[PDB]
Amino acid sequence: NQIDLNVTCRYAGVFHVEKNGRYSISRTEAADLCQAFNSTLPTMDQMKLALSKGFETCRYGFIEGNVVIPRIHPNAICAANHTGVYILVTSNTSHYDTYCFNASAPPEEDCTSVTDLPNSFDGPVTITIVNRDGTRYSKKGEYRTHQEDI
Numbered sequence: 635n636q637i638d639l640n641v642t643c644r645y646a647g648v649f650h651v652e653k654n655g656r657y658s659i660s661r662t663e664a665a666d667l668c669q670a671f672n673s674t675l676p677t678m679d680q681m682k683l684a685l686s687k688g689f690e691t692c693r694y695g696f697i698e699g700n701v702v703i704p705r706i707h708p709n710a711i712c713a714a715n716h717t718g719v720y721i722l723v724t725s726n727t728s729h730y731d732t733y734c735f736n737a738s739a740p741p742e743e744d745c746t747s748v749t750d751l752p753n754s755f756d757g758p759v760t761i762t763i764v765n766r767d768g769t770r771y772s773k774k775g776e777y778r779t780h781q782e783d784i
């Protein structure tokens with residue numbers, strides 16, 4: 635009973651979380667997942683500020699109200715070569731990665747690793763935070779509050 639959560643640098647408190655190496659998070663799960671990091675789904679304004687500080691990914695993820703990809707450098711296989719906060723408009727499907735926003739993180743680029751999951755609750759899952767540099771932090775718990783996400 636294991637969940638891997640790959641996380642990134644934080645940029646103005648915003649970071650990306652990919653679960654189990656696949657698009658696999660629902661909007662309800664995303665809010666619960668960010669809550670386990672004492673975080674919330676970013677607002678568009680928070681995401682735009684993070685982008686301005688150097689944040690980009692090549693993965694769709696929830697923010698508050700939309701599913702987006704922050705892009706700095708045009709890449710044909712990331713958000714159709716767009717720059718800025720690219721907003722997904724048309725999709726059949728409901729599961730993506732998520733972004734999260736931690737107000738207590740540093741104001742600009744924070745590329746230190748994540749070494750805790752401070753607000754997970756008691757539960758049976760081995761949850762492993764996987765940093766981009768491969769460093770890991772694991773703890774037994776749960777973060778999902780909606781049965782349909784389990």
Ligand SMILES: O=C(Nc1ccccc1)Nc1cccnc1
Nearest residue numbers: 671672673736738739748750752
């Ligand atoms: O904030 C964190 N831990 C913590 C919380 C309160 C007091 C002391 C430590 N971890 C974290 C979360 C989201 C992104 N990066 C790091």
